[PDB]
C-alpha cells in the first residue's frame, strides 16, 4: 500500500493561555497568561517576559481590560 | 501642509516617548511645549491628569528677561522648579514633549536641575 | 563554520566566556569588553 505517512509528526502542546483569570488574587512573580506573541499586553503592575509571559510584579487582583484596542492584563494591589 | 506634518510628527514622537515615560504623584511628568515664540512647561502626574504646577514664557516676568529664548527658557526652568518645590515635589521625570533634547528645551531642563528639582 | 570560541581575560588569562562566531564572517580573533570576576571589572576578553 501507499506509504502516505508523509505527515505524522507534531510538536508538544505548550500549555499556553490565561493562567490567572479576572479578579483572582495572585502573588508577585506569578505568571498570569503564557502565550505566543502579545495576545495580551502588560498593563499596570504586569511584566511581559522574555517569551511574552505576563507575570505579576506585585501581589493583588488580576484584571483584564482594553487599552486602545490592545487587550491588557493588570494587577490592582 | 508643513504645519500639519510637523504637528502630526511631533505628536507621534511624544507618544513614542510617552509609552515608556509616565510620571506619577511622587515623581511627575515635567512636559514641555515650545512654540516658535514661547515655551510652556507643566508638571502632570497623569494618574488622574492633574497638572500640579505650570510655568511659561508668557507672563511679564519672563517676557522682560534681557536676552534670547535660551534665557527665557532658563527663566521658566527656575520658575517651574521653584513652584514644584512649593507644591512639594523634588523629583520628576522630564518629558521632551516630542522635541529634540537640546537648545531651549535642554536649557529649561538644566535650569530646573540646577536649583533643586532633581530629574 | 560556527565554532565555539573561548574568551580569555587579558590580565589574569582566565578563560571565562565561551560563545560562537563565524570564522568566515570574521577570520580574526575577536575581542569584547567582558566583566572579569577575578579582576572584578570589565576588561578585554580576546579569544584563545
Amino acid at each position: 500500500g501507499a506509504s502516505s505517512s508523509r505527515n505524522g509528526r507534531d510538536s508538544a502542546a505548550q500549555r499556553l493561555g490565561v493562567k490567572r483569570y479576572g479578579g483572582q488574587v495572585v502573588k508577585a512573580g506569578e505568571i498570569l497568561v503564557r502565550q505566543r506573541g502579545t495576545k495580551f499586553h502588560p498593563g499596570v503592575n504586569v511584566g511581559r517576559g522574555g517569551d511574552d509571559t505576563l507575570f505579576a510584579k506585585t501581589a493583588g487582583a488580576v484584571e483584564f481590560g482594553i487599552k486602545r484596542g490592545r487587550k491588557t492584563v493588570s494587577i490592582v494591589g | 501642509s508643513v504645519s500639519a506634518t510637523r504637528r502630526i510628527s511631533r505628536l507621534r514622537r511624544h507618544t513614542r516617548l510617552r509609552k515608556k515615560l509616565s510620571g506619577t504623584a511622587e515623581r511627575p511628568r515635567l512636559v514641555v511645549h515650545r512654540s516658535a515664540r514661547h515655551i510652556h512647561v507643566q508638571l502632570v502626574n497623569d494618574l488622574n491628569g492633574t497638572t500640579v504646577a505650570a510655568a511659561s514664557s508668557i507672563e511679564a516676568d519672563v517676557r522682560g528677561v534681557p536676552g534670547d529664548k535660551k534665557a527665557r527658557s532658563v527663566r521658566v526652568g527656575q520658575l517651574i522648579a521653584e513652584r514644584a518645590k512649593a507644591a512639594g515635589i523634588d523629583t520628576v521625570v522630564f518629558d521632551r514633549g516630542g522635541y529634540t533634547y537640546g537648545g531651549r528645551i535642554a536649557a529649561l531642563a538644566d535650569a530646573a536641575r540646577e536649583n533643586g528639582l532633581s530629574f | 563554520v560556527r565554532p565555539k570560541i573561548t574568551l580569555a581575560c587579558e590580565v589574569c588569562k582566565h578563560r571565562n566566556y565561551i560563545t560562537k562566531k563565524n570564522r568566515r564572517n570574521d577570520p580574526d580573533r575577536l575581542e569584547l569588553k567582558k566583566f572579569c570576576p577575578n579582576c572584578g571589572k570589565h576588561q578585554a576578553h580576546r579569544e584563545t
Binding site: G1, A2, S3, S4, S5, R6 | - | -
Partner: protein
C-alpha cells in the same frame, strides 16, 4: 464542474446538519429545484441534471446552477487495508442542505420548464421540489 485549484486537497466530510441558511430562494431564474434533505451532490450528478434540463428545453430559457461541487471526497485504492494515510480525492461534491436551491430555470413556457425541472430531480440523490419566485 471542477475547482480549478483547492487550498486543501484532503478535507473532512462536509457536515450534513441543519437547514440551509443561504441560497434558499430562487434568485436568478423564475423556477428552482430546492432540496428537502441532506446529501452530497457530486459534479457528475449536477452535470447529468443540467443536461437533463437543457435537452428537455432544447433551446431558449437559461439554467443557473447555484451549487458548486468544490468539496473533495477521497478514496483509498480499491484493494487496501485500513489506515496507511488518507486516500486520494476523486469525488467532487457540494454539501446541499434542506432548503438549498440547486438549479434555477428561466423559461417562457411553464409546463415545459416544470417538466424539465422534475427531469433533473429524478437525476439527483435527493428529494427535491419545484419552487418559484413567488
Amino acid at each position: 464542474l471542477i475547482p480549478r485549484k483547492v487550498k486543501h486537497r484532503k478535507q473532512h466530510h462536509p457536515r450534513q446538519r441543519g437547514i440551509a441558511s443561504g441560497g434558499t430562494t430562487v434568485n436568478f431564474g423564475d423556477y428552482g429545484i430546492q432540496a428537502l434533505e441532506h446529501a452530497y451532490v457530486t459534479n457528475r450528478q449536477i452535470e447529468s441534471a443540467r443536461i437533463a434540463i437543457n435537452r428537455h428545453i432544447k433551446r431558449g430559457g437559461k439554467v443557473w446552477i447555484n451549487i458548486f461541487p468544490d468539496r473533495p471526497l477521497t478514496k483509498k485504492p480499491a484493494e487496501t487495508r485500513m489506515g496507511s494515510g488518507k486516500g486520494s480525492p476523486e469525488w467532487w461534491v457540494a454539501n446541499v442542505k434542506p432548503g438549498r436551491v440547486l438549479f434555477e430555470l428561466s423559461y417562457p413556457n411553464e409546463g415545459v420548464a416544470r417538466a424539465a425541472l422534475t427531469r433533473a430531480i429524478h437525476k439527483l440523490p435527493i428529494k427535491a421540489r419545484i419552487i418559484t419566485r413567488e
